[PDB]
């Protein structure tokens, strides 16, 4: 009975791959080779935010593209001002072990979570003049891979017990638990319209969840090993995916399958963060070959090399304005490229 | 030239820099210790001997110097994705129970865990303070039950000291590197201060060898 159900699951899986094989008429390289190439991309470190005293693990911009939050393993997260390199805040955390951080789109709140299993929330716009913890979000029993703000009252997370969740910050209770991964999740990427999002895990399976309803819609495979980084394409109809296989692979949401492969013979190392540009033409991948590479997202050429840091690039992020590209790393130096 | 408000923002940035460098010195003059091991293997015994829900810190001081102990075994996920948070830990305190040689292959599981942590790409330099716990129950269990069931290819005496030496020599043989770090093995007592004294003696030897390596002598 249950083995009949195993055979039924395999029949459904073969049906799914048969359908998405029927839908593949021509790959991306046949369409987008007529387009002239982007030319060589050269960028210099226009700033350097030397404040942290340990390996930094995360970084998120503001929606004004001037403030950026940056968390590190020394117990601090520091809200730089990207233009003047000024520390507008430095928030003492309660536990030093911090895997992720996020900056709310209002600019009123930040979040951070690590091995403490708690995505704590800090109120930046206080009347008492200091930052302070607004809500301690518990109940998640694994390290936090990522936190993102939807509104000032809604936050999704990405755990170590293979689940994602959705909180209401005012109540403190998780509304909609997202179960369905097998290995624990490693990234998370809200859509521009925030109706849905994409999360990645140790299954090498990116899944297209749905925020309002609460169930997975599409499951994407195609990486050999674990994936560490997902960023939506700016149209909201695709997303790239960075893995431990030295391969970035942008998937499609409409066509439900893998579209392009980004790999090179001289790189074998893992990928820690990806993010697109504003138009979407070039995606920026953060390797632990100590440097970020710049991939033409349509013709799959490595357009440029960002060789600033002297250890593992653990986080990178692109301004919503599309002007600057910050890259953080384990040598405690946020470089801001342009 | 800065404005009247940009100057006060830059003074805020510099006073924050001052509090950061002070707190970084306060943190860097401090000794951090990782705890590893399978469950019911005397980790609670060692933590109880020191002071007398994902990560668990036990913070104690000794010789006017602070010690941080990270009982990391509470939370369960993939160790491949957060153990790189712990490079720069001064000494890993790995804990094995001796009496788990026949229970279900717990000793072979602890040997695999010790191998995966000792030969790790992050813990290349970090030495290991190995403990072997519950030795008297081990004496009872080897006077009753044999020793081929844990490790198959061994033939020797069913005495405590020789079998304990064979377990110690099987654990300390897993390090593929010995020029870089050094395993400090101890057999725990019932309850005594020799436990915590061996921890600080091992930590002292580690700090002296790091200082010798940094001063250019070693």
């Amino acid at each position, epitope marked *: 009975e249950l083995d009949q159900l195993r055979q039924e699951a395999e029949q459904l899986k073969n049906q799914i791959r048969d359908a998405r094989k029927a839908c593949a008429d021509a790959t991306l390289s046949q369409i987008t080779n007529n387009i002239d190439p982007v030319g060589r991309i050269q960028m210099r470190t226009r700033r350097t935010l030397r404040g942290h005293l340990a390996k930094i693990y995360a970084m998120h911009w503001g929606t004004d593209s001037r403030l950026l939050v940056s968390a590190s393993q020394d117990g601090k997260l520091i809200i730089w001002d990207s233009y003047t390199t000024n520390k507008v805040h430095a928030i003492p955390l309660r536990s030093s072990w911090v895997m992720t951080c996020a900056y709310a789109p209002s600019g009123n709140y930040v979040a951070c979570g690590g091995l403490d299993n708690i995505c704590s929330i800090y109120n930046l716009k206080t009347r008492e003049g200091n930052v302070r913890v607004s809500r301690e979000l518990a109940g998640h029993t694994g390290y936090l891979s990522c936190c993102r703000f939807l509104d000032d009252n809604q936050i999704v997370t990405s755990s170590g017990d293979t689940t994602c969740a959705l909180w209401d910050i005012e109540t403190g209770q998780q509304t909609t638990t997202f179960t369905g991964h097998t290995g624990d999740v490693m990234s998370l990427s809200l859509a521009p319209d925030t109706r849905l999002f994409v999360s990645g895990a140790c299954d090498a399976s990116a899944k297209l969840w749905d925020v309002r309803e609460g169930m997975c819609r599409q499951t994407f495979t195609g990486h050999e090993s674990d994936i560490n980084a997902i960023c939506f394409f700016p149209n909201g109809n695709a997303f790239a995916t960075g893995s431990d296989d030295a391969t970035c692979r942008l998937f499609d949401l409409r066509a439900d399958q893998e579209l392009m492969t980004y790999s090179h013979d001289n790189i074998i190392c893992g990928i820690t963060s990806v993010s697109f540009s504003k138009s979407g033409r070039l995606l920026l991948a953060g390797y632990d070959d100590f440097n970020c590479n710049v991939w033409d997202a349509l013709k799959a050429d490595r357009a440029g090399v960002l060789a600033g840091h002297d250890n593992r690039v653990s986080c990178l992020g692109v301004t919503d304005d599309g002007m600057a590209v910050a890259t953080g790393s384990w040598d405690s130096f946020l470089k801001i490229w342009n | 030239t800065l404005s009247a408000e940009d*100057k006060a923002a830059v003074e805020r940035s510099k006073m924050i820099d001052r509090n950061l460098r002070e707190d970084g010195e306060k943190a860097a003059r401090e000794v951090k210790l990782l705890l590893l091991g399978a469950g019911e293997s005397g980790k609670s015994t060692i933590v109880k001997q020191m002071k007398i829900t994902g990560i668990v810190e036990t913070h104690f001081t000794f010789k006017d110097l602070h010690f941080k102990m990270f009982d990391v075994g509470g939370q369960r996920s993939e160790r491949k994705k957060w153990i790189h948070c712990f490079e720069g830990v001064t000494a890993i305190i790995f804990c094995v129970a001796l009496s788990d040689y026949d229970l279900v292959n717990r000793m072979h599981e602890s040997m695999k865990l010790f191998d995966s942590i000792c030969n790790n790409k992050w813990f290349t330099d970090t030495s290991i303070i190995l403990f072997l716990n519950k030795k008297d129950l081990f004496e009872e269990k080897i006077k009753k039950s044999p020793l081929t069931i844990c490790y198959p290819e061994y033939a020797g005496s069913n005495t405590y000291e020789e079998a304990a030496a064979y377990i110690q020599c099987q654990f300390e043989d897993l390090n593929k590197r010995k020029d870089t770090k050094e395993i400090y093995t101890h057999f725990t007592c019932a309850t005594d201060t020799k436990n915590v004294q061996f921890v600080f003696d091992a930590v002292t030897d580690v700090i002296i060898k790091n200082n010798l390596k940094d001063c250019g002598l070693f």
Partner: single-chain antibody, 231 residues
Framework: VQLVESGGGLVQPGGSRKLSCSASGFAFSSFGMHWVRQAPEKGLEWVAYISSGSGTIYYADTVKGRFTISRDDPKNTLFLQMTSLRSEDTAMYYC??????????????WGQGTTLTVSSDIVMTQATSSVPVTPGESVSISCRSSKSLLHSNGNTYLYWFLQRPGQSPQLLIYRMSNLASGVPDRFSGSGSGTAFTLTISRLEAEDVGVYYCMQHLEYPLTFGAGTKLEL
């Protein structure tokens, strides 16, 4: 939050006096403080300043040398040491708390004040000193600067204050455009360099007082004279 001053009373001229402002309900050590004085039937006027950590002190030229400002961070207390008191030093002295980073609202909270009775700047021009107001009508109040307040970094440093009869003045619009927290959005500010406009829409009851414009581009901080609303 609560800033409470002490050290009033009549003092013979030429003498000395120390003022004490006791702060409550906020992290005192992060804020740069201020003293602003008000002659008893005249406008507001700036006295002194400390930054955070006591790192930077400025004075107005009329009190430079005779007054010494200091702060006590572990007891949350702001001090003003006054000596050689003159006739112009008879005023109402307020204590103002202000914080400076990217996007803060300095001069946000003003203390109750205290009355003490003794027996090349940028000059700000009020257009009008008194204006009749119908309730429910839009009111436009102008200010004018002797020097252009548009700095090269995009920010023009014009603030707006409103003093109720018998109360401390409160911040309405900081940095020419940005509404303060807890301030209803009837108020609206605009303009350009050296020419400025406060706009109220549908003026209401208990919103009638004296309005001030203040530049903050350079020290000393010279306010305006004070345009008053009446019915």
């Amino acid at each position: 939050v609560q800033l409470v001053e002490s050290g009033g009373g009549l003092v013979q001229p030429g003498g000395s006096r120390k003022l004490s402002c006791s702060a409550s309900g906020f992290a005192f050590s992060s804020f740069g403080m201020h003293w602003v004085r008000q002659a008893p039937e005249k406008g507001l006027e700036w006295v002194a300043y400390i930054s955070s950590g006591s790192g930077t002190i400025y004075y107005a030229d009329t009190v430079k040398g005779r007054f010494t400002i200091s702060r006590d961070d572990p007891k949350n207390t702001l001090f003003l040491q006054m000596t050689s008191l003159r006739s112009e030093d008879t005023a109402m002295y307020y204590c103002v708390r202000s914080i400076y980073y990217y996007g803060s609202s300095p001069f946000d909270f003003w203390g109750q004040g205290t009355t003490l009775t003794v027996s090349s700047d940028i000059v700000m021009t009020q257009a009008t000193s008194s204006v009749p107001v119908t309730p429910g009508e839009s009111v436009s109040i102008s200010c004018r600067s002797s020097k252009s307040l548009l700095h090269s970094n995009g920010n023009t440093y014009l603030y707006w204050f409103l003093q109720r009869p018998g109360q401390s003045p409160q911040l309405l619009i900081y940095r020419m455009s940005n509404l303060a927290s807890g301030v209803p959005d009837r108020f609206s500010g605009s303009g350009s360099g050296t020419a400025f406009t406060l706009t109220i829409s549908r003026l209401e009851a208990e919103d009638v007082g004296v309005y001030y414009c203040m530049q903050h581009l350079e020290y000393p901080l010279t306010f305006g004279a004070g345009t008053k609303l009446e019915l």
